[PDB]
Each structure stands twice: as C-alpha cells, then as structure tokens.
C-alpha cells in the first residue's frame with residue numbers, strides 16, 4: 001500500500017450525518033465495486049479506514065459516501081468514531097491521504113452467470129453498486145438487475161436521484177427499490193431486508209424471485225444485516241456463501 005496526497009474538491013452534506021466527498025488523487029485504475037483507504041493525521045499518527053469508490057472507474061473524480069459513526073463504547077459513553085467525523089470536517093481544498101491501489105473482491109468478475117443479480121445494500125454500502133452500474137461494464141451477462149437500498153428513514157436515501165437516472169438508462173433491465181426501517185414512506189417498503197425477503201414482500205414488489213435456480217445475491221453493508229441475510233438464504237433457500245475456493249450464490253462485503 002502506497003499513500004498519495006488527495007485534494008477534496010466537493011463535500012455534499014446529504015443529511016447531518018451522511019456526506020459524500022469528491023477527491024482528486026493520483027490513484028491507480030480500479031475495478032468497480034472495490035475500495036481504497038482514506039487517511040488523516042490525528043494526534044501525530046495517520047488513522048486509516050476503508051472506503052468504497054462510488055464513482056465509475058472511468059471517472060477521475062473519486063467519490064466516497066460516508067456516515068459519521070456514533071457508538072456506545074465499553075464504558076457506557078456515547079462517542080464518535082475516530083476517523084469519520086474528521087473526514088466530515090474536510091472542506092474543498094483540504095488534503096486527504098489516499099491509498100493508490102484498490103483492494104477487494106466485491107466485483108462482477110467474482111459473480112457467476114445468473115438470470116437475476118440482486119444488489120442489496122444498507123446505509124452507505126450502496127456505493128459499490130453505484131460504481132458498477134455507472135460504469136455499465138459486464139452487465140450483459142445478467143438478464144435482470146435489482147438494486148435494493150435500505151436505510152433508517154426516507155431522508156437517508158441519498159442516491160435515490162442517481163438510482164432513478166440509472167433505472168431510466170437501463171430501460172427496464174434494472175429494477176430499483178428503497179427500504180425504510182424506522183418509518184412508513186411512499187415509494188419505500190417498510191422493514192429490514194431479511195424480513196422482507198422471508199415474507200416474500202420484496203420479491204412480490206420487484207416482480208422477480210430470489211432463488212438458487214435463477215439468482216446471485218450481492219450483500220453489502222451492516223455486518224448484522226450481511227450475517228442475518230446469509231443465514232436466512234442458506235437455511236431457507238439453500239443458497240451458499242461464495243468463498244475463495246468454493247463458488248456460490250452469495251457475494252458479501254460487510255463494512
């Protein structure tokens with residue numbers, strides 16, 4: 001891993017907690033769905049975390065979709081994460097450290113032939129799919145594309161305008177769906193992805209089945225969502241985890 005100096009060119013504050021950074025950095029070409037590392041000097045030490053590219057690999061304007069992390073530590077204190085709020089405080093012109101070579105296997109080349117490719121994401125994890133769909137390479141292999149974005153509230157569906165523009169571009173091949181867990185909102189299904197798969201509601205709304213005979217499922221995001229969806233698909237649909245030596249029906253990347 002080689003660190004290069006990047007320059008923030010744009011900061012888009014979708015909500016109080018959700019933001020996308022546009023960066024100029026001399027990174028190497030990458031495969032859509034891959035991630036790199038962003039770094040900032042905090043108390044004299046470089047602090048680094050992984051962030052997925054949201055931009056098509058053919059676009060030199062690097063885009064990152066992030067959330068300022070908040071958690072309850074072991075002492076019972078409610079605290080912010082180390083790097084995310086520092087990334088949220090960057091302004092155009094500010095420097096950010098970027099790893100030149102991308103990493104990751106959450107890519108189309110790892111996806112076998114299928115009728116329907118399901119792209120399921122929570123929160124900021126819609127990013128890799130947007131990189132894949134914007135580029136449009138190798139989607140000819142799949143008859144149907146389903147992009148599902150789950151978040152807590154409708155206001156958190158930051159890329160809904162891009163999803164709508166991608167739906168128009170794909171002329172019916174791409175089906176889009178938003179999911180909201182903490183409210184009811186017009187145009188969105190209410191709940192969590194595993195429960196909506198199990199109840200048959202997601203498939204009924206989309207108009208396509210999710211089964212081992214026709215589908216490949218990509219999972220990105222919340223580690224509990226990834227773990228719960230993989231357990232449901234294995235237990236109830238006999239869909240196996242795709243691992244380095246054992247191919248399968250599910251490709252996962254937790255954040």
Ligand SMILES: Cc1cc2nc3c(=O)[nH]c(=O)nc-3n(C[C@H](O)[C@H](O)[C@H](O)COP(=O)(O)OP(=O)(O)OC[C@H]3O[C@@H](n4cnc5c(N)ncnc54)[C@H](O)[C@@H]3O)c2cc1C
Pocket residue numbers: 035049050051052053064065066067069070071080081082083084085124125127253254255
């Ligand atoms: C391959 C990969 C790709 C990723 N891509 C992105 C991306 O594109 N966009 C993005 O926003 N994040 C992404 N992440 C997460 C990212 O790398 C950071 O973990 C995140 O920004 C928090 O780092 P931090 O320094 O702010 O928090 P830290 O100081 O590291 O605190 C993390 C603590 O809070 C918990 N935690 C971490 N994330 C969350 C969360 N989202 N919700 C609740 N608790 C959490 C951890 O379990 C840990 O206990 C990705 C992670 C991986 C593994």
Ligand SMILES: NC(=O)c1ccc[n+]([C@@H]2O[C@H](COP(=O)([O-])OP(=O)(O)OC[C@H]3O[C@@H](n4cnc5c(N)ncnc54)[C@H](OP(=O)(O)O)[C@@H]3O)[C@@H](O)[C@H]2O)c1
Pocket residue numbers: 016017067068069070071122123124150151152180181182191192193194221222224225226228
């Ligand atoms: N400061 C703020 O106002 C603010 C706002 C948003 C986020 N944050 C911080 O950002 C972080 C994560 O935020 P996020 O909302 O982007 O991502 P997230 O917590 O992963 O939630 C995204 C979606 O995933 C769902 N989910 C959670 N566990 C699941 C499981 N086991 N199975 C299926 N779906 C599951 C959530 O449902 P549920 O509704 O059931 O959780 C929600 O619909 C946290 O650190 C949070 O505290 C802060």
Ligand SMILES: [Zn+2]
Pocket residue numbers: 007024
């Ligand atoms: Zn520049």
Ligand SMILES: [Zn+2]
Pocket residue numbers: 024060061
């Ligand atoms: Zn540019």
Ligand SMILES: [Zn+2]
Pocket residue numbers: 073074
């Ligand atoms: Zn702990």
Ligand SMILES: [Zn+2]
Pocket residue numbers: 001101
């Ligand atoms: Zn190298």
Ligand SMILES: [Zn+2]
Pocket residue numbers: 114115143
């Ligand atoms: Zn076919």
Ligand SMILES: [Zn+2]
Pocket residue numbers: 138140
């Ligand atoms: Zn081709």
